[PDB]
Design an enzyme around this catalytic site. Sequence first.
Site, PDB file in Angstrom:
ATOM      1  N   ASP A 351       8.899  -1.287   6.218  1.00 44.72           N
ATOM      2  CA  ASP A 351       7.774  -0.450   6.123  1.00 44.72           C
ATOM      3  C   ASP A 351       8.262   0.796   7.040  1.00 44.72           C
ATOM      4  O   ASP A 351       9.314   0.817   7.881  1.00 44.72           O
ATOM      5  CB  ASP A 351       6.733  -0.938   6.801  1.00 44.72           C
ATOM      6  N   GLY A 623       3.261   3.578   2.155  1.00 43.79           N
ATOM      7  CA  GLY A 623       1.974   4.186   1.514  1.00 43.79           C
ATOM      8  C   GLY A 623       1.950   5.582   1.485  1.00 43.79           C
ATOM      9  O   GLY A 623       1.054   6.342   1.316  1.00 43.79           O
ATOM     10  N   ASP A 624       3.044   6.268   2.088  1.00 44.94           N
ATOM     11  CA  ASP A 624       2.939   7.761   2.185  1.00 44.94           C
ATOM     12  C   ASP A 624       3.280   8.557   1.157  1.00 44.94           C
ATOM     13  O   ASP A 624       3.567   7.668  -0.112  1.00 44.94           O
ATOM     14  CB  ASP A 624       4.075   8.170   3.171  1.00 44.94           C
ATOM     15  N   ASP A 700       3.614  -6.748   8.274  1.00 47.73           N
ATOM     16  CA  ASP A 700       2.855  -6.877   9.461  1.00 47.73           C
ATOM     17  C   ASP A 700       1.416  -7.152   9.163  1.00 47.73           C
ATOM     18  O   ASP A 700       0.722  -7.835  10.012  1.00 47.73           O
ATOM     19  CB  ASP A 700       2.795  -5.728  10.412  1.00 47.73           C
ATOM     20  N   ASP A 704       0.639  -9.348   3.406  1.00 49.25           N
ATOM     21  CA  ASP A 704       1.984  -9.364   3.672  1.00 49.25           C
ATOM     22  C   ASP A 704       2.539 -10.908   3.498  1.00 49.25           C
ATOM     23  O   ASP A 704       3.956 -11.066   3.406  1.00 49.25           O
ATOM     24  CB  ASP A 704       2.766  -8.565   4.800  1.00 49.25           C
TER      25      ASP A 704
END
Length: 1020
Positions: A351, A623-624, A700, A704
């Site tokens: 991530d 998720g950006d 995290d 997941d």
Amino acid sequence: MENAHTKTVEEVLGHFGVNESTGLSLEQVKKLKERWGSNELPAEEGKTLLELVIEQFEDLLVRILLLAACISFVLAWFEEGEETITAFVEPFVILLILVANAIVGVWQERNAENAIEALKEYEPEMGKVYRQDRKSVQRIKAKDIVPGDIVEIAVGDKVPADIRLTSIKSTTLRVDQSILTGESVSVIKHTDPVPDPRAVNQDKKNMLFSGTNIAAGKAMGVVVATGVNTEIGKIRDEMVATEQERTPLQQKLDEFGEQLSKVISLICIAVWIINIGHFNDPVHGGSWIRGAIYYFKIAVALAVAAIPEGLPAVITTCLALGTRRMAKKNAIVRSLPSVETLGCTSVICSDKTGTLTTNQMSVCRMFILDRVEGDTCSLNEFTITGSTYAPIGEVHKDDKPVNCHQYDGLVELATICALCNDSALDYNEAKGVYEKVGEATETALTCLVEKMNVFDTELKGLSKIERANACNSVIKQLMKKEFTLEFSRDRKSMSVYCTPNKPSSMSKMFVKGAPEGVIDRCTHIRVGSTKVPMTSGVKQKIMSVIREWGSGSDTLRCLALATHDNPLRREEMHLEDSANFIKYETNLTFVGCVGMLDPPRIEVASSVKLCRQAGIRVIMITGDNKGTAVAICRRIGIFGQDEDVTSKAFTGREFDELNPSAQRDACLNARCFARVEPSHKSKIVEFLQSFDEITAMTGDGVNDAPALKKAEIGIAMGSGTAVAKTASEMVLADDNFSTIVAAVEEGRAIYNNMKQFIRYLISSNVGEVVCIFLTAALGFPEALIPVQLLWVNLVTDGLPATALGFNPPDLDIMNKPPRNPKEPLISGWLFFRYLAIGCYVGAATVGAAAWWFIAADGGPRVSFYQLSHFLQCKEDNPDFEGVDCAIFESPYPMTMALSVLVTIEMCNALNSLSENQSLLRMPPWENIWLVGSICLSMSLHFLILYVEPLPLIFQITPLNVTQWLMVLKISLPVILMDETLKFVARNYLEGISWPFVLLIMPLVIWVYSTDTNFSDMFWS
Ligand SMILES: [Ca+2]
Ligand SMILES: [Ca+2]
């Protein structure tokens, strides 16, 4: 008290004598702290010494030597009572190496366990409470929570203890309780007390179970039970149940362990079989039964020597060193063998936020529209200093500190930042630096408001504590909020309904979210203090600056902030589903957009470069925005600054709108993913595993867990949820990406140390076997007796062999492609290396024994024929004159054979610092444990040679300097021969330490001063 979910929230507050707002008083806290106890459970040690020792003695190879020690004990039961420490030496020198390996394994394993436990306390569980010390939300350690304290919760934020939910601030609460009782179903929380005092845990729809995790929502309540009174300390048992799930290497070593013992047993049988003839010799006593027992004692003593009994000890030592090194790097390894398979990692999916970036979000650039000019418009691009959460900084239009009140947009923009804010700024007086309470993005807005100080409040005379919440407090007193809307994935925004405190209703519904969604849902601009309709020109200009901010070399994550000038009343508001929320924010008035920087860690840039150097593919999944993600990839080095990403960057929507044929080919090439959902993370693992690849997925969250389980290696997060941690093979306490690369490097080192250990024992112990077989073929007298064979095992297979676990990491440890577990443990070339060294070691020992017989000044000059037929030694024999048959049983040839065998294997231990690096590149002092072990082993050998009562026991005699030089003259070329073998592997198969070279040159010249050679070789 007893039945928490039976009494009203007011009732439980009255019973505890606490109010929700003010919380427990200082006297109340100190009273309850010493009355019940700290919110902690009694933690016991992992494994006791006795069960730790039994674990050392459970492998096949170690158990075999236990049998052979028992056999040698019962076999020595023919001269008992009278003999005490003479016949029983054979069992003692087998148990001596057993306890020497076990102690080292126990010592290392205890040290690895201690290193982890200290790392557990390094990062403490930190809880948010309300107390009388300060009015604002504060953070205290979880162990300091006493029953009766008012406790607030949010997204994530693992539940500290059993809490009675006083009020649910969020619209809905999603809590996963499967970690405690196994129910994965999300439960809707409520304040209605349960009528049944003994309600089933399923019926417990209002209790936040201790140790569980919260998927979403924020709640307020009072803790009822702390520590042992929690059900996580009573209902659950000790939970001592772990599954090894043998690593593909561990299955290989067990297969190699059993295959070797089959080969060793065959060899030891052959020694007995090929020695039938020498059973009636007068030396054995003339009885066949005694002859068949002596050569059986050689058969078992050779088995004890040949079998690598140090394999379990060096594996445990190597794994424990790997775990301890990781704990020093703030990385908890749950299962010990898993640190080995990290070296095999070929893909690292991580991530972006938190792992690849510090998560220290802080606003640096922000803009509001100055004026509109026809189709186009004008902007106010501001630059703000301060990369930390400290509310100190000044705003710059271009270079001038600008007043807050000079712009009507700034004061309006701060209200949107402050009112829609859900986090806060906390001053950690213990560390002296401000800390975030909530989302990092929201806290960045909070310090932004404090920096601007739009109301121009006098901040000079205020204390440090109120610096954090000065501007936010005053801006909230004038302008209050009614209720908020949950941020939903489809909407990509979070809104709030508000109404002014003074009776003006001039209610404005502030919004905040991703720039794309907010802009398309707004139709007007608040140009200063006037409303201006949105046109097609301002469509592009706003988008242009955002893409420039995001896709630019500064990697800004922007959030468009707007206002709902004419919102709908609370009567028509619906708080049921996300469908309502997306249609409740329409015809908004854009006022301006901000920008936060997420700075990648300093060492992340180098780690990504090193992984590409070692052949490891790094994939960033976030998720950006896709444009921002590609720029961040280019910033840290995943993508080159001038690299095409037309087939390596995939969004969640882009990935889904593909046939599986292209999806499989995409995962082979894809290097970054943007805007994904937890369904894809498991999908990526499946596609990568279909390619025969070892993946290290980083996760995290609670969602997941399927990804971490399916991944070959799962790496959790220190600040993440507990569910991911229990489904992961490694936990990053420091939340650092570079520690993943260090773990891969250490995993490669651990595998190499076992390969060096295997190479050392296989190549040395095969020389011991060759010695016995070569002697029998040549007809020479016996070179070694059982107690001499067992002494070689103790000296050369014990501590010197185990010290190879402490080898320094190889020079190009991170310069080679990742290992393939499919290929066998030992290659074809390594067999040639083992045999070639072992062939010389065996021939050296036979040659050293024959050197004394044939061409030694201090011994006889028996010719080759008289030595190969020494059983025909007779006084009347025509070819035996001048030699007595007593000389063929002298202990000099056995001492010559023993000392060469010990020394030549000590020199071979020096060859095992690296698979292909010469002693010139790695001097022996890189591994100081090996040098210490070699010196101790040679010291032990000298002890049994020149200490008067000892040499009779081992049937050896002291050697003078002239004989010792011959030992070194034959032992040293094993180094030279192996250097050639390393040289061939370095160059033909695919820096010099000058202080070391100038140290050994006097040694080599002195040793090779004189020379002696044999003669009259007839059959050899
Ligand atoms: Ca051995
Ligand atoms: Ca050996």
